[PDB]
Design a protein around this ligand. Structure first.
Ligand SMILES: CCCCCCCCCCCCCCCCCC(=O)OC[C@H](COP(=O)([O-])OCC[N+](C)(C)C)OC(=O)CCCCCCCCCCCCCCCCC
Ligand SMILES: CCCCCCCCCCCCCCCCCC(=O)OC[C@H](COP(=O)([O-])OCC[N+](C)(C)C)OC(=O)CCCCCCCCCCCCCCCCC
Ligand SMILES: CCCCCCCCCCCCCCCCCC(=O)OC[C@H](COP(=O)([O-])OCC[N+](C)(C)C)OC(=O)CCCCCCCCCCCCCCCCC
Ligand SMILES: Nc1ncnc2c1ncn2[C@@H]1O[C@H](COP(=O)(O)OP(=O)(O)OP(=O)(O)O)[C@@H](O)[C@H]1O
Ligand SMILES: [Mg+2]
Lengths: 256, 58, 119, 160, 75, 75, 75, 75, 75
């Protein structure tokens, strides 16, 4: 699901990505059809630029934090950092060093809230390169003729089944995280040439790569399935199977 | 067209002209002879920055 | 770092005497014990100035280990008139000094704002 | 993830794979293989006590998956042949730490494609293939024939 | 006491000696860069990079001493 | 008192030491530039920019010294 | 007593002398590496490594001096 | 007073140190100009210009010290 | 007594003079190695061994000085 969304009807999955060069916001939202001069309001009201920045930049940004608030309710953000901020706030008048140690855990909480509330962005260029390498998909789909009908990608809530992923049953990791950092979604594709359609379901999880402490890929497709549908032919392609991918690599269990 | 350059704050002379001949006549004897790049806006800044294992991004 | 350095520097101001107050009391009396010993072994001319600190090895150490030795000698050398007199003594003009002339430096120290007794 | 006791001659100063055996063990089955005596590096190459302590920290904060297996595949029946007191302490400390051992088994083959390691129990002659993700083995030795053609070595291949 | 304080402030002045050698070490390094550049101007990148990297280590010692200076001046 | 002040002013004189090494490091830098220039004059511009650039970093330390000079002299 | 203490802090300042020479010796070494690179840039990694290695040996003397400093400063 | 002035004038004498290094750097600068000229005399005027340019940056440090000298001598 | 002890401590600091010269000598030797290495890298092993050997001879004098220092410091 897309968290950052305004009343603009076009380009929903690109609204947070596109950086417009506008000085202020357009008078009216992008029109879906040709309208009449009286359909819009000339000389918009006073303080209109400040109103737009609130309902087009601030409000959709707060709806994101509210939509994904279930990912920040961990014991570290809720109890540790605020309690650490209060212990030094009682001594803020003694010296400047206490003001800093009382505000740092709050700026740290915002950073974790900021990063955790963003929409999960995978490397889509790695994905399209992966499917365009499969002959069963390129048989019906090509980049010059493919179009997106629907897109959904959101984190999975809470801890998962503690038999397929026993890693998340760690009280030290749970103290910092209340979610899993995994995401699940699909891709509705269509080809204007062959008329084919397919639902590209996929699951992702962060993995370690080639290093000790740093994550290798926060969104690694360990399950990638495509249910291709054509004029009268139905195919099911398995680019990445989870039963064979989970035997080689395990999640990363982000901390902080 | 002059109002379009003003209202968009494209007040760098000759930015939107493919051949800014007026820009070459003024720079015939200038140091670091150069003309403004095509469609250069006085507000855009494409500056980047990176941190490497060495200092100063090297 | 700024938070910790500003904190420990505060604790060292509020607290700290718990472990260093002894070293200050020791140096306080020591700074007075060595000064009293300097006045015992030091050449003072008709004014209270240690003009011969290098007379012997024991005088060099007593002059350096003292606190007021630097001032009694610096104030004597910083007094224009006192050095004009000495410049005349070197030429052969000298005489006896009264109790008021002997304290020409104490008057000079008082003028600068010093706390000097024995006028 | 296949590691050994020495560095090959094809590596330059910019290669540090030797240092990743302990660090890059995020998950999977680990094997520490000991060849058949006589071999070089009896005690100066046993790093399964430092790895356990380092791999003990990973399991505390989740860096190392909880479903991992590390076992010592010893071809020989004992670690230190000519010192029982030393070998007794090792076998005693391995148990206190919680490490598993398999004697009379020596590594035989390594498949770099699917990460398959073929082991064989010299005592029973029964071989098996096991998936690995972090493998360490002390390079095995080999007796030279020119010392046997002259009639100098005795048995194992050492000088008499 | 008062003299030891005088030596402390004096040592702080001695810290300006690396500052002098750092200047000479800089001109020497850039003097070689010029020559090294004329000999083979194709590899400007590497030469130029290694130059500043050296300049870094040179000035590193400079500020290291400055720290040592204030340290002795107050400790 | 009078001794320490005499040392403070003394250290202020020490700051003129880098000023000396900066002069030598400067002549050496331009000495090499002339050689580097005569070696390959086609790339004069590159040598020249790098020449003056190094000089900037050289007198930068010199200015930095004067800072410490007045600091101890008044702090 | 205090006289010896004055020399203790004075010797501590003297430790900034290798710091100055270490800075100059750094520029000289890297100045040569620049020229050596233009000459035969095929062995960058080799020459580059030898440069940092030699430098490490320099800081060894530097830290050695500082260690010697605090030693005589307190013993 | 006079004693502080005595160390001020003493510092004022230190200003002659860059005046000394400036002479050596000058000789080195023109030394390179000569050898560099021999290798490529086709660009004499170019070298000559950069030669005198460097000698100016030398006196820049020199006059700077004399300024610093007279200042602290009276301030 | 207290004076000769101060000179003993003073001489102990003087040992850091070879330390400075040794640091500068290190860059020079390694500089000659790098440049000499680029000119003939086929025999890097030979030049490299000779380099460290010389560096060892340098530390000989270094340790000799410190040895001399501690000696006169207590003898
Ligand atoms: C206890 C006394 C209170 C002390 C005063 C505290 C004031 C708090 C409110 C004012 C400061 C708000 C932050 C301004 C800085 C961020 C600017 C911004 O909006 O960017 C949005 C950005 C928008 O993203 P963007 O700016 O990076 O751009 C997005 C991409 N493009 C440009 C392409 C569109 O989103 C966010 O930053 C996340 C939401 C920010 C949350 C800010 C805090 C809001 C607090 C709401 C309080 C609600 C309860 C109380 C009020 C109830 C009302 C009745
Ligand atoms: C008595 C006064 C108290 C004041 C409190 C301290 C506030 C700071 C001092 C006042 C300054 C106010 C004016 C400055 C406006 C901000 C300017 C700015 O640059 O900000 C842009 C930033 C943008 O940050 P950004 O990371 O999103 O993007 C910028 C990226 N760089 C830095 C590279 C450019 O947005 C912010 O406002 C961050 C600071 C917000 C501070 C909020 C403090 C509270 C933390 C959240 C509480 C969470 C509690 C956890 C509970 C459990 C979870 C459910
Ligand atoms: C009159 C009243 C109002 C006055 C207002 C001020 C008007 C100023 C007029 C414009 C001045 C522009 C100076 C630009 C100089 C660039 C020359 C050049 O391209 O170098 C070519 C030079 C020479 O190449 P050349 O080919 O162009 O010229 C050759 C010259 N001859 C013929 C002699 C051989 O080569 C270089 O690239 C060296 C670049 C060095 C750049 C150093 C200058 C930096 C200063 C600019 C930054 C200032 C930013 C200030 C921002 C402040 C914000 C608060
Ligand atoms: N190789 C790069 N070099 C310089 N800047 C980069 C590079 N890669 C990314 N950046 C910057 O980091 C930003 C984030 O990169 P990111 O791959 O997440 O974008 P993306 O739109 O999600 O790509 P994709 O469609 O494949 O998912 C980019 O917008 C870019 O500004
Ligand atoms: Mg993406």
């Amino acid at each position: 699901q897309m968290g950052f969304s305004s009343d603009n009807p076009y380009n929903k999955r690109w609204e947070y990505k596109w950086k417009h060069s506008y000085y202020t916001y357009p008078r009216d939202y992008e029109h879906t059809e040709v309208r009449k001069p009286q359909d819009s309001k000339d000389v918009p009201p006073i303080y209109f630029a400040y109103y737009k920045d609130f309902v087009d930049r601030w409000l959709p940004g707060m709806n994101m934090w509210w939509q994904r608030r279930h990912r920040i309710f961990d014991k570290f953000n809720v109890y540790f950092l605020p309690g650490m901020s209060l212990f030094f706030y009682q001594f803020a008048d003694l010296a400047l060093g206490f003001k800093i140690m009382a505000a740092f855990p709050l700026f740290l909480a915002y950073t974790r809230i900021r990063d955790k509330t963003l929409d999960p962005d995978f490397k889509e260029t790695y994905l399209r390169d992966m499917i365009y390498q499969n002959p069963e998909i390129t048989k019906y789909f090509n980049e010059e003729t493919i179009h997106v009908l629907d897109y959904e990608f959101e984190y999975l809530p809470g801890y998962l089944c503690p038999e397929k992923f026993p890693e998340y049953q760690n009280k030290t990791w749970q103290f910092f995280n209340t979610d899993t950092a995994q995401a699940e979604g699909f891709f509705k594709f269509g080809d204007v040439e062959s008329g084919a359609t397919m639902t590209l379901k996929f699951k992702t999880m962060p993995i370690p790569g080639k290093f000790r402490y740093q994550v290798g890929e926060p969104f690694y497709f360990y399950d990638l399935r495509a249910e291709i549908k054509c004029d009268g032919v139905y195919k099911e392609v398995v680019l990445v199977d989870e039963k064979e991918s989970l035997k080689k690599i395990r999640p990363f269990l982000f901390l902080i | 067209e002059l109002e379009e350059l003003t209202e968009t704050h494209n007040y760098i002379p000759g930015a939107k002209d493919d051949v800014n001949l007026r820009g070459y006549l003024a720079t015939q004897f200038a140091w670091g002879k150069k003309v403004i790049s095509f469609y250069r806006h006085p507000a855009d800044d494409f500056k980047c920055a990176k941190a490497t294992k060495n200092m100063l991004g090297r | 770092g700024f938070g910790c350095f500003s904190i420990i520097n505060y604790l060292y101001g509020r607290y700290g005497y718990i472990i260093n107050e002894s070293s200050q009391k020791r140096a306080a009396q020591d700074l007075l014990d060595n000064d009293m010993a300097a006045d015992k072994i030091l050449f003072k001319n008709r004014v209270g100035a240690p003009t011969r600190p290098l007379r012997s090895l024991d005088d060099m150490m007593a002059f350096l280990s003292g606190s007021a030795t630097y001032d009694q000698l610096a104030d004597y050398a910083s007094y224009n008139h006192a050095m004009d007199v000495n410049q005349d003594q070197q030429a052969g003009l000298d005489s006896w000094m009264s109790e008021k002339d002997k304290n020409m430096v104490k008057y000079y120290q008082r003028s600068l704002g010093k706390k000097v007794e024995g006028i | 993830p296949v590691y050994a006791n020495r560095d090959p001659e094809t590596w330059r100063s910019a290669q540090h794979k030797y240092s990743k055996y302990i660090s890059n063990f995020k998950s999977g089955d680990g094997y520490f293989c000991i060849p058949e005596y006589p071999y070089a590096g009896e005690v100066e190459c046993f790093n399964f006590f430092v790895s356990d302590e380092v791999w003990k920290w990973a399991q505390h904060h989740g860096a190392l998956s909880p479903k991992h297996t590390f076992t010592i595949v010893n071809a020989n029946e004992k670690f230190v042949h000519y010192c029982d007191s030393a070998d007794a302490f090792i076998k005693e400390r391995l148990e206190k730490r919680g490490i598993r051992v398999e004697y009379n088994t020596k590594l035989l083959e390594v498949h770099q494609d699917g990460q398959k390691a073929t082991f064989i129990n010299t005592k029973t002659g029964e071989k098996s293939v096991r998936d690995y993700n972090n493998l360490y083995s002390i390079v095995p030795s080999k007796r030279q024939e020119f010392l046997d053609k002259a009639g100098l070595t005795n048995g194992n291949g050492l000088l008499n | 006491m008062l003299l030891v304080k005088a030596v402390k402030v004096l040592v702080m002045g001695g810290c300006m000696l690396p500052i002098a050698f750092g200047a000479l070490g800089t001109g020497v390094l850039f003097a070689g860069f010029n020559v090294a550049l004329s000999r083979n101007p194709e590899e400007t990148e590497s030469l130029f990079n290694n130059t500043l990297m050296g300049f870094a280590l040179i000035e590193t010692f400079i500020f290291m001493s400055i720290g040592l200076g204030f340290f002795v001046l107050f400790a």
